[PDB]
Each structure stands twice: as structure tokens, then as C-alpha cells.
Scaffold this active site. Structure first.
Site, PDB file in Angstrom:
ATOM      1  CG  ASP A   1      -0.023  -3.850   2.795  1.00  0.00           C
ATOM      2  OD1 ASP A   1       0.545  -3.409   1.753  1.00  0.00           O
ATOM      3  OD2 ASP A   1      -0.399  -3.124   3.776  1.00  0.00           O
TER       4      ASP A   1
ATOM      5  CB  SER B   1       2.724   1.716   6.239  1.00  0.00           C
ATOM      6  OG  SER B   1       1.463   1.975   6.882  1.00  0.00           O
ATOM      7  N   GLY B   2       5.003  -0.486   6.137  1.00  0.00           N
ATOM      8  CA  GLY B   2       6.112  -0.994   5.307  1.00  0.00           C
ATOM      9  C   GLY B   2       7.369  -1.347   6.072  1.00  0.00           C
TER      10      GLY B   2
ATOM     11  CG  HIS C   1      -0.535   0.423   2.456  1.00  0.00           C
ATOM     12  ND1 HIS C   1      -0.295  -0.443   3.515  1.00  0.00           N
ATOM     13  CD2 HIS C   1      -0.221   1.667   2.904  1.00  0.00           C
ATOM     14  CE1 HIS C   1       0.134   0.264   4.563  1.00  0.00           C
ATOM     15  NE2 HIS C   1       0.176   1.548   4.217  1.00  0.00           N
TER      16      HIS C   1
ATOM     17  N   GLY D   1       2.879   6.286   8.594  1.00  0.00           N
ATOM     18  CA  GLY D   1       4.275   6.570   8.339  1.00  0.00           C
ATOM     19  C   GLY D   1       5.193   5.433   8.753  1.00  0.00           C
TER      20      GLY D   1
ATOM     21  CG  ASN E   1      17.113  14.114  13.060  1.00  0.00           C
ATOM     22  OD1 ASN E   1      16.340  14.632  12.247  1.00  0.00           O
ATOM     23  ND2 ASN E   1      17.341  14.630  14.260  1.00  0.00           N
TER      24      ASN E   1
ATOM     25  CD  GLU F   1      17.849   9.985   7.669  1.00  0.00           C
ATOM     26  OE1 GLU F   1      18.805  10.148   8.433  1.00  0.00           O
ATOM     27  OE2 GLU F   1      17.550  10.852   6.838  1.00  0.00           O
TER      28      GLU F   1
END
Ligand SMILES: [Ca+2]
Lengths: 240, 6
Positions: free
Chosen positions: A93, A188-189, A45, A186, A61, A59
Site C-alpha cells: 500500500d 491514510s497515506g 489505496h 482521511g 487548517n 497546510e
């Protein structure tokens, strides 16, 4: 992540930020797990929209230079062929992103370990969700990567009437539901990392929370069960 | 069900 704590910089080196181009800038939209130097596992999604995506590895910050980031374009998106955007509750998903370049591994950038095919965790297994998602329902993204302790809720409990009922499938993992800590938009995934035989592995891809709110008692965060998709994942990587 | 996501 609602009710999280700030992750240490080198705790979760397979976590990625999936970002889309927005004007002259980039915006974080979802998490993901680096599974090969040139492949990321994320939620289907997250990539329904016809956007330009990049992946950031190393990553910490989102709003400041960490000195560790590598930025790479997404070259190919392979969504699970049974995914249906109209029906998140049906499952599937999950998507794989082939990166335009292979990233360089180091203390901040590592491949996520996937569970063996078919593995199901015992009820109440120790796991952490990580991500930069909202820190409150209808709140704002985190600046720094967050983690929250979210023990699993097994299928029998999770699919019971006061929890998620028929909405949850055996191809999913539920975790949390304490009313305090949860994934949120945010996240998600991204990964659910669970400790098994002394080693953390990525057992879930964050998929959904309640329409009522992120941290809702007896609505644990729901994840795609990675171990239901090992053959699919291997097949995609092998053919691409 | 609300995907989270973003
Ligand atoms: Ca940064």
C-alpha cells in the site's frame, strides 16, 4: 486522528494534504509525505479512484487561509506494481506522486527523512501519527492538523491472534491499539513519524484500521513499512 | 481490514 492534539504549525513540515477535485472545489482525501521537492509518498489505496488530485504543502487548517500553503497538481502516479485494491492485507500500500512543479522549501515545507532500508523498530518505540482524518469513528475530518502518540507494536505481538493475526505482514508497522488514539479515515497515506537517534523519520505510510472502528483496543493502526520500500522508492525516482 | 482514506 482519534484522540489527537492539535499539531504546532511547524512541527511536521513534510506532511501534505492530498485532495481531489469535487465540483468547483477540492476535498481532502488522504495524507502524504513530501520526499523530494517534486515527489510525494502516499498510500496506493488513496489513488485507486480515477480522480483529479492535487497536493497541498504548508497546510495547517483545511478550512482557512494559513498564509503558508502551496498548491500543486499531480503529474504522474506510480503505484507499487504488486498493489491489489481487493487485498489491502497483502501489503504494497504505497505510491509515489510526481508533482507538476517543484515546491519551495521553508519552515512549513520540508522533505521527510526516510529510515535506512530494512530498519525495524523495537517494540513500543515512540512515534506520532499526523493527519486531518476523522477525529472519531464515523465522525468528521479535522480542520487543523492533528497528532497522536502511537508507540509501535512489533510484528510478533501485532500478528498474534488477539491483535491482527495473519492480516498483518512483516512489510507493515503497527502502532497504537490503546482503544483511545488511532488513525482514522482521511489519515491514510500520511506519515508515522518515529524518533530514532534523536531525529524523527517517517517509518510508516498510514494504511488501514479495523472494520470495527478506528480506535479499537488491540487493533493498532497499520502502516506500510517505509524501510521495506527504500530500493523501490529510489528506483522510481531515478527512472522518472 | 478498513483502509483509512477519505
Ligand atoms: Ca489552510
Amino acid at each position: 486522528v482519534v484522540g489527537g492534539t492539535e499539531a504546532q504549525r511547524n512541527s511536521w513540515p513534510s506532511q501534505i494534504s492530498l485532495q481531489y477535485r469535487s465540483g468547483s472545489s477540492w476535498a481532502h482525501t488522504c495524507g502524504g509525505t513530501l520526499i523530494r521537492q517534486n515527489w510525494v509518498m502516499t498510500a496506493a489505496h488513496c489513488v485507486d479512484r480515477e480522480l483529479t488530485f492535487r497536493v497541498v504543502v504548508g497546510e495547517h487548517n483545511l478550512n482557512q487561509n494559513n498564509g503558508t500553503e502551496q498548491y500543486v497538481g499531480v503529474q504522474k502516479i506510480v503505484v507499487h506494481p504488486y498493489w491489489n485494491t481487493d487485498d489491502v492485507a497483502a501489503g504494497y500500500d504505497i505510491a509515489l506522486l510526481r508533482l507538476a512543479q517543484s515546491v519551495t522549501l521553508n519552515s512549513y515545507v520540508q522533505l521527510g527523512v526516510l529510515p535506512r532500508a530494512g530498519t525495524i523498530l523495537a517494540n513500543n518505540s515512540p512515534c506520532y501519527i499526523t493527519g486531518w482524518g476523522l477525529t472519531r469513528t464515523n465522525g468528521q475530518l479535522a480542520q487543523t492538523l492533528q497528532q497522536a502518540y502511537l508507540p509501535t507494536v512489533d510484528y510478533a505481538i501485532c500478528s498474534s491472534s488477539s491483535y491482527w493475526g495473519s492480516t498483518v505482514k512483516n512489510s507493515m508497522v503497527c502502532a497504537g491499539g490503546d482503544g483511545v488514539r488511532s488513525g482514522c479515515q482521511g489519515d491514510s497515506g500520511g506519515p508515522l513519524h518515529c524518533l530514532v537517534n534523536g531525529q524523527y523519520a517517517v517509518h510508516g505510510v498510514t494504511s488501514f484500521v479495523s472494520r470495527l472502528g478506528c480506535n479499537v483496543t488491540r487493533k493498532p493502526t497499520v502502516f506500510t513499512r517505509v524501510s521495506a520500500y527504500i530500493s523501490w522508492i529510489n528506483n522510481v525516482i531515478a527512472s522518472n | 481490514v478498513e483502509p483509512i482514506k477519505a
